[PDB]
Amino acid sequence: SHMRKIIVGSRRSKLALTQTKWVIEQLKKQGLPFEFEIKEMVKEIEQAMLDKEIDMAVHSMKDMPAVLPEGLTIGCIPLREDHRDALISKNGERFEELPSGAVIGTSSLRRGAQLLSMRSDIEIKWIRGNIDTRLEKLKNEDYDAIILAAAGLSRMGWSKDTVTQYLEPEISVPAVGQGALAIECRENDHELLSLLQALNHDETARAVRAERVFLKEMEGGCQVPIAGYGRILDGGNIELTSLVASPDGKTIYKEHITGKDPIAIGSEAAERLTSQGAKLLIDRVKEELD
Numbered sequence: 265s266h267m268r269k270i271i272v273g274s275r276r277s278k279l280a281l282t283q284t285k286w287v288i289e290q291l292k293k294q295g296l297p298f299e300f301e302i303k304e305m306v307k308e309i310e311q312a313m314l315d316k317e318i319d320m321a322v323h324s325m326k327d328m329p330a331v332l333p334e335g336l337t338i339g340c341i342p343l344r345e346d347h348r349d350a351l352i353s354k355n356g357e358r359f360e361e362l363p364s365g366a367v368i369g370t371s372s373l374r375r376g377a378q379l380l381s382m383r384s385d386i387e388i389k390w391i392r393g394n395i396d397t398r399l400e401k402l403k404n405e406d407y408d409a410i411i412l413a414a415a416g417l418s419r420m421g422w423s424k425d426t427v428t429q430y431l432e433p434e435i436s437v438p439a440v441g442q443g444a445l446a447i448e449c450r451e452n453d454h455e456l457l458s459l460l461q462a463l464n465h466d467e468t469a470r471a472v473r474a475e476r477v478f479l480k481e482m483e484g485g486c487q488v489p490i491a492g493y494g495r496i497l498d499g500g501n502i503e504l505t506s507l508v509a510s511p512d513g514k515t516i517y518k519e520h521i522t523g524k525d526p527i528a529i530g531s532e533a534a535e536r537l538t539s540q541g542a543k544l545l546i547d548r549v550k551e552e553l554d
């Protein structure tokens with residue numbers, strides 16, 4: 265019959281479309297009268313959305329801006345995927361087993377600084393590309409390993425054949441939002457917001473909100489050696505781990521805070537780390553990037 269057709273904007277990568285289709289398939293489980301169509305197309309997707317050219321988009325949370333444009337919102341955060349960083353070694357060695365001088369591919373200062381904090385006798389080498397391109401570069405270029413998000417590999421069904429070691433937060437604190445998706449829509453799209461409600465995972469959303477408040481107060485992002493991971497403890501409180509590192513791994517600011525209110529705990533984590541010197545570090549790193 266004649267039902268509202270929800271237009272879902274997506275990037276064209278294998279991963280982007282996979283995450284988008286995942287979300288659509290989950291929403292279909294409610295069996296409500298909506299049709300979904302993907303429009304293959306964060307700031308451009310946002311402009312299209314404000315213009316009503318699309319109704320929603322699915323992004324990786326770790327790629328979301330600190331402030332959404334007025335009139336848009338994160339209308340849903342589904343159950344988190346794996347939050348962890350993953351090591352993918354060409355010849356199968358765990359992190360501690362890689363040979364002295366092993367070249368590990370990442371363009372993330374957060375990742376590389378944490379690895380250099382554990383081992384001096386490795387090299388961190390820039391790499392770019394979508395996940396599949398990076399895995400090919402590992403094979404065909406001078407890298408001994410790469411770091412990827414476990415979540416991306418999982419979404420694609422590639423983990424089994426790729427991951428050498430899942431990195432616990434104790435040794436690589438994840439990027440804020442890693443493994444979470446942001447489903448963005450118009451703030452006034454009440455019908456779509458109600459559809460999205462059943463997919464929202466409150467324990468994930470509250471943990472990520474804490475992470476995000478911390479990142480925004482620190483003026484962090486993907487280009488900065490900053491990390492934050494929140495989870496819900498068995499008693500119900502949120503625990504937030506916050507980290508800033510020097511690019512060379514020699515200086516590490518790392519704290520844990522526990523509380524009920526994600527805004528209060530994110531803000532406190534930020535204040536704590538800023539008093540210790542982590543904000544000055546961030547500002548200096550930004551001065552020495554292009």
Ligand SMILES: *Cc1[nH]c(Cc2[nH]cc(CCC(=O)O)c2CC(=O)O)c(CCC(=O)O)c1CC(=O)O
Pocket residue numbers: 324325326327370371372373374375391392395411412413415416439441442443444485486487
């Ligand atoms: C902030 C940032 N973005 C990226 C690239 C990226 N974004 C999303 C993913 C998939 C995982 C997810 O959905 O959470 C990825 C790719 C990946 O991490 O596998 C990065 C990584 C840059 C790199 O390592 O070169 C970052 C920065 C960071 O994670 O610190």
